[PDB]
Amino acid sequence: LKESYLEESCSTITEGYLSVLRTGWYTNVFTLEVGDVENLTCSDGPSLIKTELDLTKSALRELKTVSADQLRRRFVLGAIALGRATAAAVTAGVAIAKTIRLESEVTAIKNALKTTNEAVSTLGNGVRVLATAVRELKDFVSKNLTRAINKNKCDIDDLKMAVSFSQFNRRFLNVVRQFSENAGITPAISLDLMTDAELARAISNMPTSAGQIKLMLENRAMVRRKGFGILIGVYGSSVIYMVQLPIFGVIDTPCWIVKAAPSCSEKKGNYACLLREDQGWYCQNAGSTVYYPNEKDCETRGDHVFCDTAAGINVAEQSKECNINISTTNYPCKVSTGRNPISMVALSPLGALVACYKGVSCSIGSNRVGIIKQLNKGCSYITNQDADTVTIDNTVYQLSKVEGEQHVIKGRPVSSSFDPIKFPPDQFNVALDQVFENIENSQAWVRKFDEILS
Amino acid sequence: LKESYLEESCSTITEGYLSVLRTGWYTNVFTLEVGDVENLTCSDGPSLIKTELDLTKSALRELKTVSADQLRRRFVLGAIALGRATAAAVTAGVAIAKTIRLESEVTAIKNALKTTNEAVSTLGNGVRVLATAVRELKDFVSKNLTRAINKNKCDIDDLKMAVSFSQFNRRFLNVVRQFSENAGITPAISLDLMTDAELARAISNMPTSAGQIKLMLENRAMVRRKGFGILIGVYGSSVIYMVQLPIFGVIDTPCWIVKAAPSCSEKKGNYACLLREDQGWYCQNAGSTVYYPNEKDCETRGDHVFCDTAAGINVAEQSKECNINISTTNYPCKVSTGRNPISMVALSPLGALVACYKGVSCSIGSNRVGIIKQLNKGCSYITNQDADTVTIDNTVYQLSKVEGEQHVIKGRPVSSSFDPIKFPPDQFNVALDQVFENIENSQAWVRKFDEILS
Amino acid sequence: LKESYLEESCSTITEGYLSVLRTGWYTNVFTLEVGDVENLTCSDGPSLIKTELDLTKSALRELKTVSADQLRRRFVLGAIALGRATAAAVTAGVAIAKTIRLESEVTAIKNALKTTNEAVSTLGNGVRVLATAVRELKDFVSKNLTRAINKNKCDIDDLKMAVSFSQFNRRFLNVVRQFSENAGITPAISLDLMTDAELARAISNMPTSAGQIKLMLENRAMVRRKGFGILIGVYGSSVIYMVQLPIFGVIDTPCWIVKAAPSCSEKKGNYACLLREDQGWYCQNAGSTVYYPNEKDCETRGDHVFCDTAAGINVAEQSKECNINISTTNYPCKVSTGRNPISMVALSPLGALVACYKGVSCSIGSNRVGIIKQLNKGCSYITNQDADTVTIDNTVYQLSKVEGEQHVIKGRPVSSSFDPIKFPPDQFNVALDQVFENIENSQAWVRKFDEILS
Ligand SMILES: *[C@@H]1O[C@H](CO)[C@@H](O[C@@H]2O[C@H](CO)[C@@H](O[C@@H]3O[C@H](CO)[C@@H](O)[C@H](O)[C@@H]3O)[C@H](O)[C@H]2NC(C)=O)[C@H](O)[C@H]1NC(C)=O
Ligand SMILES: *[C@@H]1O[C@H](CO)[C@@H](O[C@@H]2O[C@H](CO)[C@@H](O[C@@H]3O[C@H](CO)[C@@H](O)[C@H](O)[C@@H]3O)[C@H](O)[C@H]2NC(C)=O)[C@H](O)[C@H]1NC(C)=O
Ligand SMILES: *[C@@H]1O[C@H](CO)[C@@H](O[C@@H]2O[C@H](CO)[C@@H](O[C@@H]3O[C@H](CO)[C@@H](O)[C@H](O)[C@@H]3O)[C@H](O)[C@H]2NC(C)=O)[C@H](O)[C@H]1NC(C)=O
Ligand SMILES: *[C@@H]1O[C@H](CO)[C@@H](O[C@@H]2O[C@H](CO)[C@@H](O)[C@H](O)[C@H]2NC(C)=O)[C@H](O)[C@H]1NC(C)=O
Ligand SMILES: *[C@@H]1O[C@H](CO)[C@@H](O[C@@H]2O[C@H](CO)[C@@H](O)[C@H](O)[C@H]2NC(C)=O)[C@H](O)[C@H]1NC(C)=O
Ligand SMILES: *[C@@H]1O[C@H](CO)[C@@H](O[C@@H]2O[C@H](CO)[C@@H](O)[C@H](O)[C@H]2NC(C)=O)[C@H](O)[C@H]1NC(C)=O
Ligand SMILES: *[C@@H]1O[C@H](CO)[C@@H](O)[C@H](O)[C@H]1NC(C)=O
Ligand SMILES: *[C@@H]1O[C@H](CO)[C@@H](O)[C@H](O)[C@H]1NC(C)=O
C-alpha cells in the first residue's frame, strides 16, 4: 500500500487496494424432502423413535404458518445512503420469490429434479436459477424407517434406528427453526440452508468469466457472508426455499481510503477549526469514481476490499483534487467548521493522526520500551513503524501493523489562514468556498457602511 | 395499493396500506424444573450417563452468576427518534422483572402451579401475568434416572437411559447457554425459551378483542419476532425466567409511505438543488397522525405494515399538504438544499425515481429483451410494469414487482423557480419558507442600499 | 442515585453511578486437537461411526479455506464518534493475530504446551498471552476409536463408541461452524470457543490489581459479552484460534447521565423552541472528564456502568456548568433550535419529561387506579413515584421503577427570553451564545440603518 499525510487539509489518503465489487445476485432453489411422516403412527407408549417422529411431524405442522411476504388471513451524502444496500437486497429477493411461489413454477422445478439432484432451470420471467434437491431424510424414511415400524410398534429393541433417525433429521429441524425464528427471511446463510459442497457447486455456475469464478471458489466464506435465504413454502411434504448469493463480477480495480481529524489554529486564545467530511472509501470503475460514505459496507481482507455497488454514490473525477490542493480547487470540497477544539486520534491503515489541543497530554510508546516521547500541540502523523501505542490523556490506542510506504506532503494548514475572530458560526457539511464567501460578504458590507460618510 | 408521483416536489407517495400497531406488552413467566441432579453421584468411571449428568450439574452451577439488573459483590426529527423503541422495551421488561424477583412473588407464583401447568396470576403491583411450568426433565430424573443410579454406578449396560437423558436435557442446556452468552437479557425468543404451542397458548390469553387475537394466532411468527426474554433467577433447582410479547392492539388503520430524490435545476451551468426530508411512514390512528422517520422500525408483510408506537412522532393533520402544495402551504415542509447535483435511484414500492444529471448515463431494461431505452436528464418516474432493471452509469437495480395503480400529478418543479445565482448556502432540515425568507431578505437589503443615493 | 430536574434548560441530570471502564485487551490462544482422523478409513458401508468420522474429516477440509486477514490465491460530536470502538477493537485483534501466525510463534506456543495444558507465554513482540490446549477429542481418537476400527470395519456392534464419538466431536464441529459462518472473525465468544472454567482461568491471570480481578471474576458474563475470536489457522491437525477479552482496569469512578426534551415558548401563536444537545454519559477519570455521546456503547447493571474508553471524547471540566447556568456560562453549550413545537416523552432513570404542545393531550396514571390526572401545556417532570404510565395522545409509556431521590431546580426557561418573531432559522448543534450573537447582530444592523437619516 502507500499512505500520504496531507498537511494542508490535515488528513491522510491510503492507496494501493484492489476492489471486489458485487454486481448482481444468483439464486439457488432448494427442495428438502421429508417423506411420509404424517402417515406413520405409534402406539407402544414412550420410546425414542416416537419422540423423534413427533418432533418431525410437529416441525412440518409448525412451518405452515410462516410467510416471507403475505399475511395469513384464514446534501449530507452520508445520510442519502445508509439503508440502500439492504433495502435493495431484500427487494430483489422478494421479487424473485413472488415468481417462484406460483404453482406452474414449482411444478416445472419439481419436474426438472425428478431423475437428478441438480438442474439449471429458467423461471417464467426469463431468469435462470439453479434448482437442487435434498433427499437423505426421505430415502431413510421410505427405505428403512417405514419397514421397521410395521404394526404401530416403536418400542423395538434396535436402538440403531433411533440413533440413525436422530442423525438424519437434524438438518431438517435446523432449517425449520432458522426460518421460524426469523419470520421467514433469514439474514445470513447457515450451514443448514446451504452446506459447503453446494456453495462450491453454485459458485461454479455463476454468469461471470473465469477469473472471478476462481476468486470466489477460493474465497467462498466471503461469498456466503453476503447472502440470505427466503422461505418459499411447504408443498406436499417438501420444504422449498431459496438462497441468494452475490456475484463479485468486477475484481482488481483501484481503490483508496481517506481519513481525517480536526485542524484547529489558535490566535489570542481563540480557535478556528475545520474538519474534512468526505472520508471513507472510493473505488474506480470503467473510468467513473464511486464514493462509499458509510464505512460499514466495505470490508478489507488483505489489500482487497469487498464492496457493494448499491451503497455508493457516483462522484466526478475532479473529486480527487481535494487531496492535492483543498483550498483553491473548483470542486466543492466538503468541510465542517467550529470554534471549539477537539482532541482525538484517528487511526489510519498505516498509522494514526493525533490532534492534541489546549488541555490534553499525548504521548507515543511501544511494548518493550514504554513511553517513547511526548507530542507537541497541533496535529501529528504517527507512523506505525515508530510507535506501537498512542496515548491521549488516559486512553491508549494500538496501531495496526500493516507494512507499506509512508509519505508526507508539505504545506501550511488551511485553518491557519483564518482570523479566529470573524470566523463564521458552526457549519455542517458545507463547501469550503462557501466559508470563504461568508467572510468576504461580511467584509464587503462593512466596507459599504464605511464608504458612506456624508 | 396506489402510488402517486408528485412532479413539483419530485417525490412519490404510496397509499393503501393497513397498520398493525404494537400497543403494550404481555408477560409469560416460565418455571423450568431440573430435579435433584445436584445430589446424584457416580463412581464407576467414564460413561455416558456420567458425562450427561456432569453437564447438567455444571449448567446449574454456571447459571447462578448471571444477572440481568444487578452487579454481584459476593429540529431533525430523524435524530430525536432512533433509540426510543428499544430503550422503552428494555425499561418495561426490567421494571416488571424487579417486581417478580421478590421472594413473596416467586412463592405465590410457585403456589399457583402446584397442581397445574398453567395459571393466570396477578403480581403485587396489579399486573396480570401468565405463569407456566416445564416439568419433563424433572419427571425423568425423579421417576426413571434416580432408580437406575442406585449404588453410585453409571457404567450400566442399558444405553436407552443414556440416549433418553440426552434427549431430555437438551432444552435445559440450550436455555442456559442462551442466557449465559447474552448477559442475562436475550434479544429474541428462540424455540428453547418459548416453544410454538406455548406461543399460541399465550396469544389466546392477551387483553384485546377477538379480531386482533385472530390476527395474532394466525401470524405468530411476527409476534415472536418482536419479543425478548429476561432471566429472573435460579431458585432451588428451578430456573425462572420471563418472556415479553407484543400486543398488536390496533389493526387495519390507514398508512402511507413517502420517498424522494434530489430535484435540481440548471441555468448557465449553475445548479440549484432541493431534496425533501419528510420521508418514511405515516399512520393514522383515532384521528391523529404519527410519523415514523426511521424506516428500520416499520416492517411490511404485504398489504399490512407492522409498527411500534414508541418510535413515532405525533405530527399535525396538515402535514399531508406537503404532498399537494409544497410551496404555498402554511405547514413547514422540511427540505435540504445544495448547489451540487447528485445522481441516484430511489426505489419506491411500485417503481423507481431516477435522478440523472450532468455526467451520468441512465437506461431502463428488462430480463428478456435487454436494454429498452435511455433516459433524459432530470428526474423521472419509472413504473415496474414498464421495466425490470434501472441502470445508473454502471449500477443495476431490480425494481420490485408489486401490483397497483400508478398516477402522475403534473406541476412545474419547485427547484425551477430559484435563481442558481443568489441561492442560499447548503441547509439541512430547514423549512422551505425559510429558504424563501433568505432570498427575500437579501433582495430587500440590496434595495435598501440602492435607495440611499444622496 | 439522585436526579435533578433542571427547569431552565428543561432537562434532567442523574448522578450516583460508578464506572467500570475498559482499558485494554487480554489474549488467550487456544489449540484444539483433533488427532489422526485423516488417517482412518472405513469400508463396510453405512453405519454410525462412518457418518461421524466423515463429518470430522470434512470439517477439517472445510476450515482450510477460511482466512481472517488474507485473500487466498491457492462539530457534531455524535458523528465524530460512532465507529471508533469496533474499528479499534478489530484493529487490535488483527494486529496481534498477524504476529501469532508466524511459524516461529506457533512452534514456540506448541512447545510450551507439550507437557501441560496451560502456560503463560510471551510472543516475539513482547506481548504476553495465555496459551491453552484442548485435548479430549485427540485422546479419544488415539486411545479408543483407533483401536476398535482395526481393518476398516465400522459396522461393529458396539454402539457405545458411536454415541461417545457423537458426544466428543460436538465442540469441534461447533467451533468450525462458528468460524466458517462468520468469515473467520466471530463477533462474540460462544461457549464453544471459550467455556466457563477457561473464562475464569483467563480472568485470574489478567494484569490488574486484586479489586478489578475480583469484580470480573464475580461478573464474568459481562467480560465475555465484550470479546471476540479470530481464526489463526489449521496446522497439522490442530485448529489454532485466539480470544480477545476486555480488561476492566478502572472501576468505581463517578459518572452521570444527561437527558433532555424540547423547550418551547409561545407568544401570539408563534413558537420559539430550543433543545439541548449534550446528552448521554459522562465519567470522571483521574481528574479528566470523558463524554460518551452514543448511548449504545455504555450499559448499566445496577448503579454501575460498563463504558468503553475508545468511544468517548475528552471534554473540559467546565462542561458541567451547562447543568447549573446554561445562559451565562463561558462555555459552548450545544443547542438546537426551531420554530415548530414537538410533543414527546423523554424517559429518565427516575421518571419522565413530558413535552405537551399545540394539539396533544397528555395524562398520567397507574395500574390499579387508571387515569390519575391530566397535564398542562409545556414541559413537566413526572417522578416514578406518583405515576406508573404516561400517555401522549394515544401512546402509553411505562416508567422505570428505580429508587432514588428526585430534586427540582427552579428557574425560568431560556425559551421565554426569545421573541418568537425575530428568531433565527433552524440550527443544528450550535453553541447557545451564537444564537444570542445572531439576534444581536440583526438588531445592530437595523439600528445602523435607523441612525442614518440625512
Ligand atoms: C420412565 O418411567 C415411566 C414411568 O415409570 C415410563 O412410563 C411407563 O411406560 C409404560 C410402558 O409399558 C406404560 O405402562 C403401560 O403402558 C402400556 C402402553 O404403552 C399399557 O399396557 C398400559 O397403559 C400400561 O400402563 C406407562 O406409560 C408407564 N408406566 C407407569 C407404571 O406409569 C417410561 O416408559 C420410562 N421411560 C424410559 C425411557 O424408561
Ligand atoms: C438403510 O437401508 C439401506 C438400504 O436398505 C441400507 O444400505 C444397505 O446396507 C447394506 C449393509 O450390508 C448393504 O449390503 C451390502 O450388499 C452388497 C451387495 O451384496 C455387498 O457390498 C455386501 O454384501 C453388503 O452387505 C447395501 O449395499 C446397502 N444398500 C442397499 C441399497 O441395500 C442401510 O444400511 C440402512 N441403514 C440402517 C441404519 O439400517
Ligand atoms: C477411552 O479410553 C480410556 C482409556 O483406555 C478408557 O478409560 C478407562 O476406563 C477404565 C474403567 O474401567 C479406567 O480404569 C481405572 O481402573 C482403576 C481400577 O479399577 C480405577 O481406580 C480408576 O478410577 C479407573 O476406573 C481408566 O479410566 C481407563 N483404563 C485404563 C487407562 O486402562 C475409556 O473407558 C474409553 N472410553 C470409552 C467410551 O470406552
Ligand atoms: C397416508 O395414507 C393416506 C391413505 O389413508 C394417504 O392419503 C391418500 O393418498 C393418496 C396417494 O396419492 C391420494 O391419492 C389420496 O387422495 C389421499 N387421500 C386423501 C383423503 O387425501 C396419505 O397421502 C398418506 N400420507 C402421505 C404423506 O402420503
Ligand atoms: C440429597 O438428597 C436429599 C434427599 O432427601 C436432599 O434433601 C436434604 O437431605 C439432607 C441430607 O443430606 C437433609 O439434611 C435436608 O434436610 C434435606 N432437605 C430438606 C428440605 O429437608 C438434599 O438436598 C440433597 N443434597 C443436596 C446437596 O442437594
Ligand atoms: C496417515 O498415514 C500417512 C501415511 O503413513 C501419513 O503420512 C506420512 O507418511 C510418512 C510415510 O510415508 C510418515 O513417515 C509420516 O510420519 C506421515 N505423516 C505424519 C504426520 O505422521 C499421515 O500423516 C497419517 N495421518 C496423520 C494425521 O498423521
Ligand atoms: C395549498 O394547497 C392546499 C391543498 O388543499 C390548500 O389547502 C392550501 O390553502 C394551499 N395554500 C395556499 C392557497 O396558500
Ligand atoms: C453561571 O453559573 C456558574 C455556576 O457556578 C458560574 O460559575 C458562572 O460564573 C455563571 N456565569 C457568570 C457569567 O457569572
Author numbering:
A (entry chain C), B (entry chain B), C (entry chain A): 19 to 92, 103 to 482
Excerpt from the paper describing this PDB structure:
It is initially synthesized as a single chain precursor F0, which is cleaved by host cell proteases into disulfide-linked F2 and F1 subunits, with the latter bearing the fusion peptide at its N-terminus. F mediates the fusion of viral and host cell membranes through a large conformational change from the metastable prefusion (Pre-F) to the highly stable postfusion (Post-F) conformation.
A stable class of Pre-F trimer particles was isolated and refined by imposing C3 symmetry. These structures were resolved to 3.3 Å and 3.1 Å respectively and showed high similarity, with a root-mean-square deviation (RMSD) of ~ 0.55 Å. Substitutions L473W and S477F in HR2 introduced a compact aromatic cluster at the juncture of the three helices. This substitution stabilizes the energetically unfavorable helical kink near the fusion peptide’s N-terminus and preserves important interactions that anchor the fusion peptide at the trimer interface. The stabilizing D209E substitution is also located at the junction between two protomers and forms intraprotomeric contacts with R205 and the interprotomeric contacts with R252.
